[PDB]
């Protein structure tokens, strides 16, 4: 369970104390972690990651590698406090303002922040299509939710994102079908003993960062166990076809 910073940056007194109180509960050392860090004057100066920019001669797959490297440099947020509030129903232009702030302030992030950043950083790539892909999995009597940014370049499929696991985020845009991309994620979940239950597929997101349209996160919802393997593939390919036809 996570707290969300809702007061902007800098983090206000109540939210900052809540973060440290949470750390003291979770970390076996507890108060000594805060004792060492809070007010310390010798802490490392972390470089602000450089936002990637692209010459027109750089191929799009190489740009995507740089976007993912940038996302990774921010680091996965293990503090227990999410530093940016993401209201998923916001107009795209407001989520793009937030993405800009994420690049300016350079704090750790988790999967949903990464999806917003991936859009922000690929709006300059009109020959690339971007659409969210959400997963619901099951392990040891609990459900887990995850989100990545699906991408489509030159008829191939890939993904950008942020996960604590290496094989649950970045996928180079090499998969011939959307089915093959999603089945790769399913296999990666299987390898860490999670059962994939649901996949939710969004529609393509405008490249206009001033668009007032909403992101459509749950356009297609697939019940993996109920559909079975053959209809799972069929539905995935139906979502992909609709997206391509609509373009």
């Amino acid at each position: 369970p996570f707290f969300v910073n809702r007061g902007g940056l800098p983090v206000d007194e109540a939210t900052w104390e809540r973060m440290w109180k949470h750390v003291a509960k979770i970390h076996p050392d507890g108060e000594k972690v805060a004792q060492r860090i809070r007010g310390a004057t010798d802490l490392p100066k972390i470089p602000i990651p450089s936002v990637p920019t692209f010459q027109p001669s750089t191929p799009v797959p190489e740009r995507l590698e740089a976007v993912q490297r940038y996302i990774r440099e921010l680091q996965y947020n293990h503090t227990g406090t999410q530093f940016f509030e993401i209201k998923k129903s916001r107009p795209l232009t407001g989520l793009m303002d937030l993405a800009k702030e994420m690049t300016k302030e350079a704090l750790p992030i988790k999967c949903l922040e990464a999806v917003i950043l991936g859009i922000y950083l690929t709006n300059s790539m009109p020959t690339l299509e971007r659409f969210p892909i959400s997963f619901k999995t099951y392990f040891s009597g609990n459900y887990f939710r995850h989100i990545v940014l699906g991408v489509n370049f030159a008829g191939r499929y890939g993904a950008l994102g942020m996960s604590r696991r290496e094989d649950l985020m970045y996928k180079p845009p090499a998969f011939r079908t959307l089915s093959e991309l999603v089945l790769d994620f399913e296999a990666a979940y299987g390898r860490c003993w999670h059962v994939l239950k649901k996949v939710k597929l969004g529609q393509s997101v405008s490249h206009d960062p001033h668009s007032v349209e909403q992101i459509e996160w749950k356009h297609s919802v697939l019940d993996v166990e109920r559909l079975g393997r053959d209809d799972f593939r069929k539905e995935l390919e139906r979502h992909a076809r609709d997206m391509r036809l609509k373009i």
Binding site: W16, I26, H27, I37, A40, L43, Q75, H78, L107
Partner: peptide, 26 residues
């Protein structure tokens, strides 16, 4: 800027904390 100073001080503590918590969640 006082606000800029706060954010720089907080960002250093956030990344120092994140290193500790990442080492914990391995």
């Amino acid at each position: 800027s006082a606000q800029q100073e706060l954010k720089q001080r907080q960002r250093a503590e956030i990344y120092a904390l994140n290193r500790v918590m990442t080492e914990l969640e391995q």
